[PDB]
Amino acid sequence: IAVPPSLRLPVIEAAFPRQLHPYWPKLQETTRTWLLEKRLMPADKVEEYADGLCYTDLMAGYYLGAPDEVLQAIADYSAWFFVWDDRHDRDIVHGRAGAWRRLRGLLHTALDSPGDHLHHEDTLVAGFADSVRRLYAFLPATWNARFARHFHTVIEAYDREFHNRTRGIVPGVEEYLELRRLTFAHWIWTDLLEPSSGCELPDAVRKHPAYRRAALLSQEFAAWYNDLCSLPKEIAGDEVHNLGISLITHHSLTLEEAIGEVRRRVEECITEFLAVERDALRFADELADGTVRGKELSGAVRANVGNMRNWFSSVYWFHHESGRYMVDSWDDRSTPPYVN
Numbered sequence: 254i255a256v257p258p259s260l261r262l263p264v265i266e267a268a269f270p271r272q273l274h275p276y277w278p279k280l281q282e283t284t285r286t287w288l289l290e291k292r293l294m295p296a297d298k299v300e301e302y303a304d305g306l307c308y309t310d311l312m313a314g315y316y317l318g319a320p321d322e323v324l325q326a327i328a329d330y331s332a333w334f335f336v337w338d339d340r341h342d343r344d345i346v347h348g349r350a351g352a353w354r355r356l357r358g359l360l361h362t363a364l365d366s367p368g369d370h371l372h373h374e375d376t377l378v379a380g381f382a383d384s385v386r387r388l389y390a391f392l393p394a395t396w397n398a399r400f401a402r403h404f405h406t407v408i409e410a411y412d413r414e415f416h417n418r419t420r421g422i423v424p425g426v427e428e429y430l431e432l433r434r435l436t437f438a439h440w441i442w443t444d445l446l447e448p449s450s451g452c453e454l455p456d457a458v459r460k461h462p463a464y465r466r467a468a469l470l471s472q473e474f475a476a477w478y479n480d481l482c483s484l485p486k487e488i489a490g491d492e493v494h495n496l497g498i499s500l501i502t503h504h505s506l507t508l509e510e511a512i513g514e515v516r517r518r519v520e521e522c523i524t525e526f527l528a529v530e531r532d533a534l535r536f537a538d539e540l541a542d543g544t545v546r547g548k549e550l551s552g553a554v555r556a557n558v559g560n561m562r563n564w565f566s567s568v569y570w571f572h573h574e575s576g577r578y579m580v581d582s583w584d585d586r587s588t589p590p591y592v593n
């Protein structure tokens with residue numbers, strides 16, 4: 254309830270009130286069981302840590318209005334995503350370049366044919382395939398293909414991160430901001446707005462400048478606020494990918510100065526979002542031209558922009574609730590207790 258001053262965003266607390274999807278209690282346990290049954294974490298670590306990681310809370314505060322089974326698929330995928338980030342980190346730390354390379358190729362393949370990988374020997378690949386197959390069942394194949402196109406790009410950004418960290422390369426500020434839109438998977442979360450509101454948006458709608466800019470700002474806030482909040486753990490873990498680190502490294506900023514510059518950029522996302530949110534909601538109003546399809550399109554854009562806004566509050570409170578970032582409570586600050 255009380256946020257550290259250096260992380261506190263009064264505009265979020267006053268103007269972005271938290272929302273919670275009514276399915277969240279069953280969501281929490283169902284994802285916990287999925288992590289167990291897919292063997293994505295040891296049973297000991299699931300029982301001790303899964304709930305305290307707040308992964309399902311993060312999604313349940315974001316995709317409001319989603320059908321229960323859509324939110325379940327999203328939450329399982331999101332938990333898988335955190336575990337994949339953990340495997341990526343461990344492969345880097347132990348120099349398992351071959352294991353990472355093979356996983357990367359398997360994920361590319363599984364992304365295009367998830368059914369063929371539902372029982373793969375690698376449980377991380379099998380869990381990926383199961384979540385992706387379920388996400389592919391909600392909307393037409395044209396949405397499935399866009400999801401895959403986007404996630405192929407994400408996988409390759411993770412590979413670039415692998416190269417950067419093994420070689421000890423800190424990306425430039427602009428290089429990093431470009432790469433961060435892919436490692437954070439901006440466009441996957443944006444894609445998943447549409448099954449949550451039940452509608453694949455035509456390209457002309459979702460590429461409207463107000464929709465695109467609202468969608469961008471929501472994810473930039475989420476990624477850069479994560480950078481601000483995960484900075485201690487990431488410095489502790491020899492992580493190089495973080496806006497603050499790029500600023501210290503290439504703009505010769507101190508730690509206090511870089512934190513302040515990240516904080517400022519986070520705050521600007523909020524007020525930039527508020528301005529373009531008005532345009533995006535005017536756009537939704539214009540889509541209701543009187544036809545049945547127009548009303549559905551209008552409702553779906555409104556829902557999605559609504560959830561772009563919810564992302565701000567969900568991500569904010571998640572970083573203060575989740576055990577994932579409490580580096581100060583670990584016996585080994587470079588080894589989070591929840592990774593294998």
Ligand SMILES: NCCC(O)(P(=O)(O)O)P(=O)(O)O
Nearest residue numbers: 335338436437479480483577
């Ligand atoms: N994308 C989820 C994982 C992260 O946000 P986290 O800071 O490790 O929790 P990353 O910074 O690796 O992207």
Ligand SMILES: [Mg+2]
Nearest residue numbers: 338339342492
């Ligand atoms: Mg990480």
Ligand SMILES: [Mg+2]
Nearest residue numbers: 338341436494
């Ligand atoms: Mg990462």
Ligand SMILES: [Mg+2]
Nearest residue numbers: 479480483487
């Ligand atoms: Mg981070």
